[PDB]
Amino acid sequence: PPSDHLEVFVNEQPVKIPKGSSVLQACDAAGIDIPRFCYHQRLSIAGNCRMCLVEVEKVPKPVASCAMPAGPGMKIKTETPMVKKAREGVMEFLLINHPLDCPICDQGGECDLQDQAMIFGSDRSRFVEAKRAVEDKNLGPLVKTVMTRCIQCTRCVRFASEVAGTAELGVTGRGRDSEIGTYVEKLMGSELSGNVVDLCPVGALTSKPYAFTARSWELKGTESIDVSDGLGANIRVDARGTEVMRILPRLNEAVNEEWLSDKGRYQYDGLKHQRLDKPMVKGPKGLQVATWQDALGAAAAALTSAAPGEVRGIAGKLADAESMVALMDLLRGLGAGDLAHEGGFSDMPADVRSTYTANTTVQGLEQSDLVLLVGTNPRWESPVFNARLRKMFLDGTQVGLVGAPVDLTYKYEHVGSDPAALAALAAGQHPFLERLKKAARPAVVVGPGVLRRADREAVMKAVHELCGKAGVVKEGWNGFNVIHDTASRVAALDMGFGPSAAARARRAQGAQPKVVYLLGSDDYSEEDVPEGAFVIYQGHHGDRGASRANVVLPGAAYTEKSGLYVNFEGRVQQTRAAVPLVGDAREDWAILRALSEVVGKRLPYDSHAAVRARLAGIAPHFANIDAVQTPVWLNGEYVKGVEALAKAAPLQPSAPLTSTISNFYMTDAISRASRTMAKCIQARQQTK
Amino acid sequence: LVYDIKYFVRDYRRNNKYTARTVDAKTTFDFDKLYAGMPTKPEQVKNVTRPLIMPTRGY
Amino acid sequence: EFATASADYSIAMKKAAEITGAAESAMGPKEGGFTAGVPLDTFTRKARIYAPARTASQSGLARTVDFATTTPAWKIEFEPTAKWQNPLMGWTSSADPLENVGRSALVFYTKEEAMRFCEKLGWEYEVTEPNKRRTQRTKRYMQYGDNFGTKRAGVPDLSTLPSN
Amino acid sequence: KPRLKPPFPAGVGLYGCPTTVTNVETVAVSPTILRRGPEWFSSFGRKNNAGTKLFCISGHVNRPVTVEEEMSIPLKELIERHAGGVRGGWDNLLAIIPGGSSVPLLPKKICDGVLMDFDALKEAQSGLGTAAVIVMDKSTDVIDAIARLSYFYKHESCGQCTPCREGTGWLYDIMTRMKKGDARLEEIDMLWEITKQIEGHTICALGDAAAWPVQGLIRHFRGEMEERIKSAGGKKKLAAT
Amino acid sequence: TNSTDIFNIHKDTPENNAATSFEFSEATLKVVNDIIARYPPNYKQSAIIPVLDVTQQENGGWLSLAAMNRVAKLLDMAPIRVYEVATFYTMFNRTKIGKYHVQICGTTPCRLQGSQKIEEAITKHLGIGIGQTTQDGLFTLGEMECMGACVNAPMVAIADYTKGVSGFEYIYYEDLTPKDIVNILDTIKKGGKPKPGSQYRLKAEPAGAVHGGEKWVPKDGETTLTGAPRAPYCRDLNA
Numbered sequence A: 001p002p003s004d005h006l007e008v009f010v011n012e013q014p015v016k017i018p019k020g021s022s023v024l025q026a027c028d029a030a031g032i033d034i035p036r037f038c039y040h041q042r043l044s045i046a047g048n049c050r051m052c053l054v055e056v057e058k059v060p061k062p063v064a065s066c067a068m069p070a071g072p073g074m075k076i077k078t079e080t081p082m083v084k085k086a087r088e089g090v091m092e093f094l095l096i097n098h099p100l101d102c103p104i105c106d107q108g109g110e111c112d113l114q115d116q117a118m119i120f121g122s123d124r125s126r127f128v129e130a131k132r133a134v135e136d137k138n139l140g141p142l143v144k145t146v147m148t149r150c151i152q153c154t155r156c157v158r159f160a161s162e163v164a165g166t167a168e169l170g171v172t173g174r175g176r177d178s179e180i181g182t183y184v185e186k187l188m189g190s191e192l193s194g195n196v197v198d199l200c201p202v203g204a205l206t207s208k209p210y211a212f213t214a215r216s217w218e219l220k221g222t223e224s225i226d227v228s229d230g231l232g233a234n235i236r237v238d239a240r241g242t243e244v245m246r247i248l249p250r251l252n253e254a255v256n257e258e259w260l261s262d263k264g265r266y267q268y269d270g271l272k273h274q275r276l277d278k279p280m281v282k283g284p285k286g287l288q289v290a291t292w293q294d295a296l297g298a299a300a301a302a303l304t305s306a307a308p309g310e311v312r313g314i315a316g317k318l319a320d321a322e323s324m325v326a327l328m329d330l331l332r333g334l335g336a337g338d339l340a341h342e343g344g345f346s347d348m349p350a351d352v353r354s355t356y357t358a359n360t361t362v363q364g365l366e367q368s369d370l371v372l373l374v375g376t377n378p379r380w381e382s383p384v385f386n387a388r389l390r391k392m393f394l395d396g397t398q399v400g401l402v403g404a405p406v407d408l409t410y411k412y413e414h415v416g417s418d419p420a421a422l423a424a425l426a427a428g429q430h431p432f433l434e435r436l437k438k439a440a441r442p443a444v445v446v447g448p449g450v451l452r453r454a455d456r457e458a459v460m461k462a463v464h465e466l467c468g469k470a471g472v473v474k475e476g477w478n479g480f481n482v483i484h485d486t487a488s489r490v491a492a493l494d495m496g497f498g499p500s501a502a503a504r505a506r507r508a509q510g511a512q513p514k515v516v517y518l519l520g521s522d523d524y525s526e527e528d529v530p531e532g533a534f535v536i537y538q539g540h541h542g543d544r545g546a547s548r549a550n551v552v553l554p555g556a557a558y559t560e561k562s563g564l565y566v567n568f569e570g571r572v573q574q575t576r577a578a579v580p581l582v583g584d585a586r587e588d589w590a591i592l593r594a595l596s597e598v599v600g601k602r603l604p605y606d607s608h609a610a611v612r613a614r615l616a617g618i619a620p621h622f623a624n625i626d627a628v629q630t631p632v633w634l635n636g637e638y639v640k641g642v643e644a645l646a647k648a649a650p651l652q653p654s655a656p657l658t659s660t661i662s663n664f665y666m667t668d669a670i671s672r673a674s675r676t677m678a679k680c681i682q683a684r685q686q687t688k
Numbered sequence B: 001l002v003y004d005i006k007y008f009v010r011d012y013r014r015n016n017k018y019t020a021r022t023v024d025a026k027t028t029f030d031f032d033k034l035y036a037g038m039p040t041k042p043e044q045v046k047n048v049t050r051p052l053i054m055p056t057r058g059y
Numbered sequence C: 001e002f003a004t005a006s007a008d009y010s011i012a013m014k015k016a017a018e019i020t021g022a023a024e025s026a027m028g029p030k031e032g033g034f035t036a037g038v039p040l041d042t043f044t045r046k047a048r049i050y051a052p053a054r055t056a057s058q059s060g061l062a063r064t065v066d067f068a069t070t071t072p073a074w075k076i077e078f079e080p081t082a083k084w085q086n087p088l089m090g091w092t093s094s095a096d097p098l099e100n101v102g103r104s105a106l107v108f109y110t111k112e113e114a115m116r117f118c119e120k121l122g123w124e125y126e127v128t129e130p131n132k133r134r135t136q137r138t139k140r141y142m143q144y145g146d147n148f149g150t151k152r153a154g155v156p157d158l159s160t161l162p163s164n
Numbered sequence D: 001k002p003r004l005k006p007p008f009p010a011g012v013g014l015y016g017c018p019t020t021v022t023n024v025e026t027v028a029v030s031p032t033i034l035r036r037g038p039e040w041f042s043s044f045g046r047k048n049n050a051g052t053k054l055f056c057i058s059g060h061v062n063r064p065v066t067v068e069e070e071m072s073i074p075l076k077e078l079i080e081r082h083a084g085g086v087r088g089g090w091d092n093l094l095a096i097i098p099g100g101s102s103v104p105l106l107p108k109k110i111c112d113g114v115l116m117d118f119d120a121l122k123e124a125q126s127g128l129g130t131a132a133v134i135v136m137d138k139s140t141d142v143i144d145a146i147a148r149l150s151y152f153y154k155h156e157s158c159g160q161c162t163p164c165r166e167g168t169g170w171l172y173d174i175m176t177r178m179k180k181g182d183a184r185l186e187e188i189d190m191l192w193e194i195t196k197q198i199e200g201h202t203i204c205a206l207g208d209a210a211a212w213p214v215q216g217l218i219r220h221f222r223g224e225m226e227e228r229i230k231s232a233g234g235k236k237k238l239a240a241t
Numbered sequence E: 001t002n003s004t005d006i007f008n009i010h011k012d013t014p015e016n017n018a019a020t021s022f023e024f025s026e027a028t029l030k031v032v033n034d035i036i037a038r039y040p041p042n043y044k045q046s047a048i049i050p051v052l053d054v055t056q057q058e059n060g061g062w063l064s065l066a067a068m069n070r071v072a073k074l075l076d077m078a079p080i081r082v083y084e085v086a087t088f089y090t091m092f093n094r095t096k097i098g099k100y101h102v103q104i105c106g107t108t109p110c111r112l113q114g115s116q117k118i119e120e121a122i123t124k125h126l127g128i129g130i131g132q133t134t135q136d137g138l139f140t141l142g143e144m145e146c147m148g149a150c151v152n153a154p155m156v157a158i159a160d161y162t163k164g165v166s167g168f169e170y171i172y173y174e175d176l177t178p179k180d181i182v183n184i185l186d187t188i189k190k191g192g193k194p195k196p197g198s199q200y201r202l203k204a205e206p207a208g209a210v211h212g213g214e215k216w217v218p219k220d221g222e223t224t225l226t227g228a229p230r231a232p233y234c235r236d237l238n239a
């Protein structure tokens, strides 16, 4: 390369930077953190706040370091008298029209304007004129505006145009009367609309559900993971004692960059309603509060009095791996085999991890120049993943879709809508195959709605044939990806949480269980929980599954426990407890260990480390937290192995490949109890 | 300071420095110069006067 | 030339940490907890060694591992224990003695220093490496001049001109 | 709203393509220069200041006019001939803006002798600009005139960058207070400091064009501003006591 | 921003709401489609300012929400960009005005010549201030910055919206006194055509001046380009 790293001088120190880097990036590589208001790493460069002004030799004016490219042998000075005078003057211009609002503003304590004024500004003002006053704007139930505090950095406009894709904000007026918003009364309709509150450096845009409730210095922050979908976005939970006050994203470039959907950000208020805090046993009066010994004894009596073939265990969408392996080992120790998952396709073969995970990974998908989506709506399954797909679209990656046509906030080519179109694509009838055959690194993304189908094996065989013909998987590149929408599904597939052959046969001839264990399940089908059965519900919210149960055992939510979750790319991540257990609830694996002791066959582990070691004994990649293995690819041997499942239950070429998520804002028991999600739905209903 | 509000000309808090001296090994402490500047008679003794006030910087 | 925070008292703190004889002090495992004199069940609890990420609300980087050599950024944290409400007033009650001692007082320059402290005190620890920031921008909007490039809608076709 | 340079319009301009923006008068004189020769064009005016120029003379002038003339002509020659001179005689002159509105004014002493030239108005702490000449006489409130210029620059700010958008209104407020004399004497030095804070610190050159008339007013008529402040207390301090 | 438009956000009115309809006529649609062809097809958005001007004569001197939405659909761009352009520029009226839009320059070269006395004369005659419309719906008074007619200061521009797009007239009236602008307003009100340009000379040629904003005072002197025009000529481009 022709010296792809160039050398600059920052305060007489030599710094090597990549080519095309700005002056601000050279200052950052020298260990200097230049003040800024309009620059962002994820947005396009604007250059309008004038706070990043530094001095370059042989230039008589201050340059804007965010926008100015760095040339070879450049000499940058960041601490001369003109730089300090520039910083103080620009701060003084920023503060003359700002309202004296720090007591009533929610950014007070974590404000860029306050801290930068304290450090790089003066201590006085000389301004005694009247200020500019601006009326506030309505942008929906999630974003609160006090527009007198706007400093015209246009981060919101650039975000709405570039990442969210909706492009609904603009600057109206001219000069001092420039004004941010929508000209007409509109609602911010993006699923990623809470991120702009983080992007605003001031209290012009604040979070409406959070408003006036806390200051940032009072909050104990815990780094956890998000379980509202299958991506597992990295988050920080802020709590005051026993109460969670807000949820924010945190940086992870391999998973979520810096974003978080509105469901994962705003569903925390469902943790304050309908909570199970006591064990209950159903008596002649109904469910009534009982001791833990009594509730464990009743559950053990019902689990032991029934035959082993009349017991079924259903895992919920939010069950961690430790509780799932505990329930699996407890039910298998009694001679049962009927295991089911609330997220569907419980009879799916889980032999090779590459067949139900994203082999390209999330960050490795950016090296693809052509993407074919099969039967998925990524905007409602994972809006952060869809934002990364839009980022790929903006720098040249072409997108095609086989499925039901949906709004994706980027242009795509609709190849078809049914498996007949998939077969026509594999044969060669559609010209998109020649586009895939000439692509350097093609990618195929299969959504969870395909795997929920009754004919999923034939569709997966067609997808495998298409990948074989189009060079999707070859030497040096694996472009085959299967994504999920539930937090607990991949861990259950990893550990082997699946029904036995005898249990599948008994379901085929129509045997009905008498005892059902509901491990956090509230979206079960009626075929799996018969009426008149004995129901043991273990969970944290009182919902459909708890209103029907005979024994209720209160567990922990994901803000109260440290459980393992695996996302759809195969990465093992963990929650952390941000608040203690509520009431008389317990840890979720501990309930099953105590219940195995009361039944009469103890589980061989007595600690959290020991049940994690049992998980690592089943599949060794469980021990490597915050990392992803490279899964083995067995070419067409796996598809040859399951041809009996392709011959039975044949293909349905007329049923469209759709997405199963029909309610984005309410997908589980926590989001169904959230009043903010209900207001979000009501806002979209009252606009018609 | 009502109309002249610039701060970096009076930022005494952040303008102090600590500097690592060159390693004090092969220096030349001459005791002859130290004792040559000392008086030997009652007159020619010079005393450091007591400071009247601590620095106010004009305020 | 060498100038890495060379204008403050931290020069006089980096040395005095490398004074000979005192820079090689070492103890066996769990030995510092025996001589600490605090109850021995305190060391049955688990600790986390990690550097906290940047807050999403602000853009500054001073409390991150970017300035790790300048400022201690690694922390030791413990799991929460039970909390409840006071019946008379509603204040949050606790019985945890390690409720704020790791988050207020224990800060370290590196990961290995916090590990050494945990090892000599007897705490079992898990270490969490922080997520590394990426500085390279996207291909679109890489520089300021790509805002106005020909990648917006392609090269303009000159077919609507007069005389075509 | 202007773009930041770099990039430059000859590299990345209209529709991402190489582009040159030129003035009408620059474009129009080119065929005559190509037909009549460069040596004919450079025979007018001083060195590095070649050619002819259209001059617009407006304000307190007996015969306001758009007239073509050789460059490096004196102001007094350009006004007394071709325009009928200053209304009331040359001794009734107070100030002249020589280059539109974005350049600082000049008083009577500089104007008598200075040539209307690029390298002659610049050394007189002004500029040729567009060579638009605005003449004021001794009946003019020059603070009021520069205050209306400050109002213009407040009205015409595009609002993109912080110093122009916030400080043109501040300059207008301070100038409006100075016109009535409702100010303090050190607020004049504050006003100079605020113009120095705007100038050179913005995206485009409208911020400099907003700072420059106030700088010229302060520099050449600070005594008038001080007298306006002092004599306002002859009508404001009679109510305080 | 101009006069008469104190809001940079939309305010619902029975005349101006989302239910209001706008559509082009045949000839106006021909004009708009001819404007669009001046620009590349993939940069069709370049045509927004002339199209919005033509829409402003079509709608009767102002832009409604329906007109802006129609223009947004026509140029295949988001409506917020159209709202940005329409609120950014001074000529675009976003509230309903009168039939003739009277705009007076107030910048310093016109101000020295006595534009304030012309404003006083207009306000004493028509009975309205800047930013107002008469009770008859005839005249709307506005203020403008420098109009590039400073050697003929003080001047007024008057916009004609009584004939639609085909008969749109934007006429400068220059070198004015109170009597001249009163006569021009009376001539417009009576249905005649007042004379365009300067009221005491042809063009920017040397002649007298308005002294004190109340009286034209003619003055004789040297005038250039009084002889015969120059013949065609070219040097020898070879050597």
Ligand code: SF4
Binding pocket: A098, A099, A100, A101, A102, A103, A105, A106, A107, A108, A109, A111, A112, A113, A114, A149, A201, A202, A203, A204
């Ligand atoms: S944004 Fe809010 S907290 Fe920050 S300086 Fe302004 S009023 Fe104070």
Ligand code: SF4
Binding pocket: A149, A150, A151, A152, A153, A154, A155, A156, A157, A180, A199, A200, A201, A202, A204, A205
């Ligand atoms: S609302 Fe916030 S992000 Fe948007 S321009 Fe104003 S300060 Fe910037």
Ligand code: SF4
Binding pocket: D001, D002, D156, D157, D158, D159, D160, D161, D162, D164, D165, D202, D203, D204, D205, D206, D207
């Ligand atoms: S100096 Fe004024 S006109 Fe120029 S970019 Fe900045 S705000 Fe806009």
Ligand code: FES
Binding pocket: A035, A036, A037, A038, A039, A046, A047, A048, A049, A050, A051, A052, A064, A065, A066, A067
């Ligand atoms: S950060 Fe560069 S001008 Fe705002």
Ligand code: FES
Binding pocket: E105, E106, E107, E108, E109, E110, E111, E145, E146, E147, E148, E149, E150, E153, E155
């Ligand atoms: S100042 Fe009125 S036309 Fe220029």
